[PDB]
Amino acid sequence: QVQLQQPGAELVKPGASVKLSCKASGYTFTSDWIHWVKQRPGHGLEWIGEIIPSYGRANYNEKIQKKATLTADKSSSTAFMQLSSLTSEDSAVYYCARERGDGYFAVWGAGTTVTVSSAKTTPPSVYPLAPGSAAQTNSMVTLGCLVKGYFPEPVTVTWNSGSLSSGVHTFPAVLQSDLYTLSSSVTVPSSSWPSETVTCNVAHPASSTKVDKKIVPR
């Protein structure tokens, strides 16, 4: 089972604050330390701080500006990270990790994508991508769906509820006029469509929306 559970995304206004969470499961020891790591897009890993839930003691990176405040709830087994007064420089993916007190990070959370802007949350519009009536096909056929006009990052695209993962591409989003847009492709044998259902699932954590779109021929 998943040991560390983090929310997908958090939209923050410049100057405001946010409190990220990290619910834990699995084996729990008093020697356990919960760490937080910051990763900016296209950058590397950056240790923010640590905390031992069985005492409430917390340490922080001295080489960076202190934006964080670490707390924990022993009952709900949840670690908290208070980020205050955020700018565009604080926009990154924040991971939480568990250390057994032996130096290494055995398990990581999925990470929370924190976006700092004054723009508004916008759910995505999902449109199907079926081949034209004149397009020929080989042994394989290429389908897809268009995720456009959402904010902020990220979105998770799966095909047939994750049961279909072979031959899938999901392109990085492009930003235009405070709205993101991407596409995802899927390649199945031409003999299996549309005799077998193909559907893309699009989750947008920031708006708590998840939609489905079946890909039927035109």
Partner: peptide, 19 residues
């Protein structure tokens, strides 16, 4: 246990793991 708790937070400390 107390050593690790006390040493962590101080740069250069080597007494920071339980084993």
């Amino acid at each position: 246990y107390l050593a690790v708790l006390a040493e962590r937070g101080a740069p250069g400390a080597q007494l920071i793991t339980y084993p």
